[PDB]
């Protein structure tokens, strides 16, 4: 309501709702406006939509962005905390022309900064994780600010609980995974798979078999690999340790990471020496969570397939994402100008996919109301040559009916994929069961 | 609700929602009132309403017509433009006796004078062509004037995005059938396969096979054609190359279009020799344009049919969109006063075909709530003799039910077509599958 | 019963029911035999069976394959006519290196020596064509013998009647086509659409459009294009004038054919210029009639396309006819080892493809009772680079129920085609409706 009158909207920033910049008409001033539609999760959303405004109203650290005001629309929500054009920091990093021990701890002492901030006000992030770690702007010292989400929690002063299953399965610690009471020190084990990654540029744990990344994660099954690590500052190595602890009783404490600087005092005292290497590995990792890291919605079993099946995977992905969230630009993109279908609203018939969908992403089930989340199980694929390939799996959806009632659909699909251009397109499509 | 007392409403002008010349009663001047239908397509529409709205609320140019405001009422909303009585451009000029290159570089410099006004506004209208460029009057020394639709855009500054897939396939940039990001220069392009066609009365680009015509369109395959070719100034054939460029970066800027006058200068210094042949098949690919680039919603196989089928369609095309519209009038011009239905409604019977439909375009589905959208798949034509034919076709056709569910249904429909009085008459239909 | 204990069986020679070699052991001599399974069309079939038995037991040429008996056993039936290993005449004489008119006399004489043969007995072969034209042995002098089908019938005397619609579309008199009694005469016209094929190597009459090659035979226009056909005599232009003659009255009897020797004489007098050129065309059409003349199941609308996607159809068609047949060995050829199906019998679950479909060509409907006429309906191709390629169709299958009773079944098949190793495999296959 009152977030159409004051501001003016511009270009998205990033999308999961959608950021988008703004700038304040009455007092003119830049800011990022996350638009969450009114349709989120029922509860299980609304709860997690006054947690983050509320911490982020907490929040003020001079490393993180903090908000400004909450506003409430019809069919929308609005929450403007502070702007930023600054890209990723492991993107800006890579870029880097002199990458050393001192740049590295020039970023975990800001790190610890904004986490050490929030401990003391009774908040832990758990979510700490590359992707949560931005650069300011791209001007020179420009500040790393901790990105507050969202999987996020108030803890009574130090009491230890059980706070349930969150974050990502490499920045998991072990308390968590043991399902045991946990707290504050669950982002601090974060910090060191994070200065690991933040050094020799590959993670600590890692497995395809998620029940066995989780086992060395529950272990601390991690080693500091010659050659690389024997360029590496015994410090370094040593914060890592303290980090990297089992248990979260004996771990360093964020305010106990400062204080020992082999950041402050090797930022004095440290290794320089620019690791081209390192930091090459890094942005090749990098690239790979971006694309791996599509969605925690993929269920099947494989053993290290060509990458070119993995980008297959990520792009089936990303049409049936634009499919639910009702964007149409997107979907053309995807899709063949003389795509054909096969499907249960065909009737039995064969069409031209340019002007049968239009109809869907106009006005059926394009932004509803309720999220239907969907599964893909045992997706199967076919690869012919280098520019062809077509998927087959099948897709779970659940949602909720007009009763409000949740109900589940399974649908076998089959898609045709012909790369022109550089660029995947679809072409035939084949779906089965009944309508989405 | 203000649209009802302050203006008066006369003659139609053109259809799509309905064009109307009104004159405002109380500061006295004519208008044209686009009239919106309450039934547009939900939201993918309301929209572009606003967005067409607001463009235009932005765009004036003296070469555009500029808007004055936009009423809603209750059942309608009303768009009020600037109004014109010119007849399309590509049909003034067959009329004209004495045509140049000089007259055709008048005429491409008004439009780049409307194209560059809005470039510079961070606006690309993405659908330029012949149809959308009309004449203010009859009047001597019109105006060509620039018609803002509606696949039409926003851009910031100079940054190229993904809009999505729109515009008409003659009329697409490369970047665009590509699935490129793309921006003002896809705007360029159209100018470019326009002037062409204003100078040689052909297209660059065709191909019955569309996948084909894409092909060329991708490729830049245009060519100049001796002899008619031969008699035009190889400025001329500069700037062509210059619009034409397929990599956008290069492209010619519209700024950049003007300057360069084969147009101004030619204008000044070009051939005037009246090319007769020239416009002559300008003005027929006009009417074949008019009569074939009827709908985008026909799917089917020929090669390059006797024109009577090609007629034959359009007008089986015509009636099934006087149906859906609910337009009487038109539905008892194209049907025999003794026409014979044999249909789903007829419970079994044979009916007499002025009696039993009145009561459909009555009260029941004419004009109800939301667009149907109709599909005419493997349609198959009978020609017997000059003055008689038969046509047997699949419609499929996407609907809003009560409960707001969007549904499909499949109907097999023949109709039987009798050539009296020069025009086509519906004899007799026959109806198979639901109730439409 | 009998043909059990009296034959031994060997390698077969064709297939439609299946032709295979055999030996009589009682009094050893060899033989060839039509397998006829039981299952044929309950009486349509039965009808033609003796027909052409019968007519078989009459015609005793020297030209033409003569029977011994017909045996009937109890789930097959038995027909064992005289033996031949020769191939095909139209390919003989692509081999040849020496083709001349005096080859092509010497041709067209033993054919209509087997022809007035039955004339005079009261018998017209209505289906005259290169594929039932055959050699009897590869070694020299090895006659040309006529291939008694099937549809075959008994005239009275010279009376003309109406015997229905017959035979192959380009050999097809227009008496026929004009739906008019007719008779022997028939036959004379098909040699006419021969000979002048067993001269240039090309067909009289051809169209795409079927409706227009019917036209054209129905007015017998054909025409002697020059260069090839400036060193043809003109006896040799004469008999085909005499034989391509409309009106079936004043038509070359086949008597008149042999007495009049632009073939006995022209052996005697004619040009033997040895045309290689026109053996070229020859060999070229004769594969691509048997790539193309592969079934009359076919509906769709295309205009001469690559001729990779008339091969592709081609392989289709020959996965369904396997199917149907019961035959899979001929069915693992034509698939991947690792095939993946979607499929009804599915029961929703993807498959890998040579465990599922083992079953149903076990005791399914392999060889079940009675034929299921299939019918293929607007396919559609997509090719994607030069390895790869997908069809999507609706086959409609008509067949004979427990009841006995017919029905009908729609389905859509998606099928997906790899070449690996210059052979075209099945990869995935998608099958939508009902299972078959
Ligand atoms: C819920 O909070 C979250 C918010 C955000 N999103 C952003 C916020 C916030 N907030 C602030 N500022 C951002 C600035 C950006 O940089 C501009 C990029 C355009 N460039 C144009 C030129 N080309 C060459 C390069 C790209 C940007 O995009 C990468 C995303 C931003 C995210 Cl990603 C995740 C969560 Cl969880
Ligand atoms: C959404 O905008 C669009 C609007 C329009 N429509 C028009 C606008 C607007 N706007 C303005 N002025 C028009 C003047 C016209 O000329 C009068 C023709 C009557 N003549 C009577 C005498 N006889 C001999 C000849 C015909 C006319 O009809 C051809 C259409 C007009 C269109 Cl076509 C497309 C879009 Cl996308
Ligand atoms: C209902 O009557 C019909 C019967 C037949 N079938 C045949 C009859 C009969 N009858 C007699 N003799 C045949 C001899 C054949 O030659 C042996 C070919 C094996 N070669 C092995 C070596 N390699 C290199 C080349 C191939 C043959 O196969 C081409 C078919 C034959 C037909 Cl095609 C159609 C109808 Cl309508």
């Known amino acids: 309501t009152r977030f159409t009158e004051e501001y003016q909207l511009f270009e998205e920033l990033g999308k999961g709702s959608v950021v988008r910049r703004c700038v304040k008409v009455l007092a003119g001033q830049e800011y990022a406006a996350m638009i969450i539609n009114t349709k989120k999760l029922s509860a299980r959303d609304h709860q997690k ?36 054009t600054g890209g990723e920091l492991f993107e800006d990093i890579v870029a880097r022309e002199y990458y ?67 974050g990502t399965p490499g920045y998991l610690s072990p308390e968590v995974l043991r399902k045991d009471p946990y707290g504050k020190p669950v982002d601090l084990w974060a910090c060191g798979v994070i200065l690991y990654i933040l050094l020799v540029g590959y993670p600590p744990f890692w497995d395809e078999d998620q029940h066995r990344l989780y086992q060395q994660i529950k272990a601390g099954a991690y080693d500091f690999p010659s050659p690389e690590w024997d360029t590496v500052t015994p410090e370094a190595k040593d914060l890592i340790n303290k980090m990297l602890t089992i248990n979260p009783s004996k771990r360093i404490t964020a305010a106990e990471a400062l204080k020992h600087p082999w950041i402050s005092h090797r930022s004095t005292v440290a290794s320089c020496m620019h690791r081209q290497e390192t930091v090459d590995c890094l942005k090749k990792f990098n690239a790979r969570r971006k694309l791996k890291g599509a969605i925690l919605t993929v269920m099947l079993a494989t053993r290290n397939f060509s990458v070119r099946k993995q980008e297959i995977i990520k792009v089936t992905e990303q049409l049936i994402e634009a499919i639910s969230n009702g964007d149409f630009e997107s979907y053309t993109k995807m899709c063949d ?40 199980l045992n997706p199967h694929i076919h690869l012919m040559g280098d520019e062809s390939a077509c998927i087959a799996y099948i897709r779970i959806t659940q949602y909720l009916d007009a009763g409000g009632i949740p109900r589940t659909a399974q649908s076998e699909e089959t898609r045709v994929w012909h790369r022109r251009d550089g660029k995947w397109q679809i072409v035939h499509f084949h779906r089965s069961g009944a309508p989405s």
């Open 100 to 166: 050393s021990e001192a740049d590295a701890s020039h970023c975990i002492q800001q790190i610890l900064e904004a986490v050490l901030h929030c401990h003391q006000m009774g908040v832990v992030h758990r979510n700490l994780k590359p992707e949560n770690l931005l650069l300011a702007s791209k001007l020179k010292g420009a500040a790393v600010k901790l990105a507050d989400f969202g999987l996020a929690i108030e803890v009574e002063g130090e009491q230890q609980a059980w706070f349930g299953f969150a």
């Open 49 to 84: 939509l006054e947690r983050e405004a509320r911490i982020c109203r907490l929040l003020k650290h001079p490393n993180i962005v903090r908000l400004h005001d909450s506003i409430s629309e019809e069919g929308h929500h609005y929450l403007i905390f502070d702007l930023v």
């Open 337 to 376: 100008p003389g795509m054909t279908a096969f499907e249960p609203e065909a009737l039995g018939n064969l069409v031209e996919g340019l002007d049968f969908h239009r109809f869907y992403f106009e006005n059926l089930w394009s932004r509803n109301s309720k999220p239907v989340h969907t599964t893909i």
